[PDB]
Amino acid sequence: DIDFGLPAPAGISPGLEATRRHNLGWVRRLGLVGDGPSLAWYTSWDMPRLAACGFPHARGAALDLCADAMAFFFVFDDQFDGPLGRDPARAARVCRRLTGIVHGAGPGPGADACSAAFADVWARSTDGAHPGWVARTAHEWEYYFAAQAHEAINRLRGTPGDMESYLQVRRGIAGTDLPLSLGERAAGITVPAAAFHSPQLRIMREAAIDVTLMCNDVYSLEKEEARGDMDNLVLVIEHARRCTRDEAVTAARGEVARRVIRFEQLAREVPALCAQLGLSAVERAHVDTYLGVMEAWMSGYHAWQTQTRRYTGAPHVLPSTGPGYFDEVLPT
Ligand SMILES: CN(C)[C@H]1CCc2ccccc2C1
Ligand SMILES: [Mg+2]
Numbered sequence: 001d002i003d004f005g006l007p008a009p010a011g012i013s014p015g016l017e018a019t020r021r022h023n024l025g026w027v028r029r030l031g032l033v034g035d036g037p038s039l040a041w042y043t044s045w046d047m048p049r050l051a052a053c054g055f056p057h058a059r060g061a062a063l064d065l066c067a068d069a070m071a072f073f074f075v076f077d078d079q080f081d082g083p084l085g086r087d088p089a090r091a092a093r094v095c096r097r098l099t100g101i102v103h104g105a106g107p108g109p110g111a112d113a114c115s116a117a118f119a120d121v122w123a124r125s126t127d128g129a130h131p132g133w134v135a136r137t138a139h140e141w142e143y144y145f146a147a148q149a150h151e152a153i154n155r156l157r158g159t160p161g162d163m164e165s166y167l168q169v170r171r172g173i174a175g176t177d178l179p180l181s182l183g184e185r186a187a188g189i190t191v192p193a194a195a196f197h198s199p200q201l202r203i204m205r206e207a208a209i210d211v212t213l214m215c216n217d218v219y220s221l222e223k224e225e226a227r228g229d230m231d232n233l234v235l236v237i238e239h240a241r242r243c244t245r246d247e248a249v250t251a252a253r254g255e256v257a258r259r260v261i262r263f264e265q266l267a268r269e270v271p272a273l274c275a276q277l278g279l280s281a282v283e284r285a286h287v288d289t290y291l292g293v294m295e296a297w298m299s300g301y302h303a304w305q306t307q308t309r310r311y312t313g314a315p316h317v318l319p320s321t322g323p324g325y326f327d328e329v330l331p332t
């Protein structure tokens with residue numbers, strides 16, 4: 001009964017079905033997903049539809065990379081729904097292993113499934129990419145991995161943070177701007193740095209990422225609250241404001257809506273901004289596609305989460321009385 005006012009997706013990638021086939025083989029081949037309950041549970045998430053709705057510009061092997069990257073995010077995420085997420089030092093050490101892969105230390109044969117899957121996603125991501133994209137996205141991955149242990153610290157504390165501290169942890173553990181870096185890469189575009197760092201596009205990028213993680217906070221609250229998770233916008237608002245759950249959900253909707261309004265107000269300025277910078281027609285085309293990538297990510301993430309089984313299913317198939325996975329795939 002919660003709708004954030006986002007438009008339905010203007011399009012879906014035509015590669016959904018082909019990518020479903022690729023990604024099913026990929027998660028099994030890497031050892032990221034097993035057979036039986038884990039495979040049925042993974043399948044019920046519909047990672048291919050997340051990729052096709054979230055990245056409608058992606059075609060062919062580009063959409064495959066989007067789905068595999070999402071597969072890594074979601075499988076790796078769930079490994080912390082258990083003792084690992086209550087052990088910050090252990091989480092930090094595991095995440096340092098993954099961070100070493102970001103910065104050039106490939107894992108080698110026989111690495112664990114999470115290390116091997118990440119290394120494959122990261123190698124495919126950087127192949128042929130602009131060095132400015134590689135440097136930025138490498139730092140985005142570092143933030144994602146490094147933030148996990150702080151979520152665990154907050155779990156042990158047992159109170160939500162203030163809004164500023166919530167944003168610092170939650171933006172990291174949500175994957176920071178990685179979905180947009182992935183969408184840019186999958187669309188085959190390179191945002192000119194002069195446009196990328198405009199105040200309008202910097203604010204818009206931040207707003208779009210906040211929109212999707214906050215939409216997720218509302219839909220994933222039931223499975224997260226029961227596990228003692230603290231970095232969820234609804235819990236943060238309730239704790240800060242001393243309000244009811246309904247009032248906190250309504251306020252969370254408002255945090256999303258005001259960011260969508262800001263994004264759309266600034267998007268109106270993007271044609272003029274490109275003219276002021278004297279960008280070439282091709283540069284302007286890449287900026288226009290970047291705008292579409294951001295718009296499609298916001299609408300597509302939400303379209304996916306309304307139809308997936310991940311959020312309605314989790315409390316029943318992986319109750320909070322046990323770990324949030326059927327198989328351990330991340331050695332700690
Ligand atoms: C690590 N989490 C599984 C993240 C992965 C990326 C993402 C992007 C937007 C909204 C929610 C999420 C869940
Ligand atoms: Mg999670």
Ligand SMILES: [Mg+2]
Pocket residue numbers: 077173
């Ligand atoms: Mg998480």
Ligand SMILES: [Mg+2]
Pocket residue numbers: 216217220221224
């Ligand atoms: Mg969530």
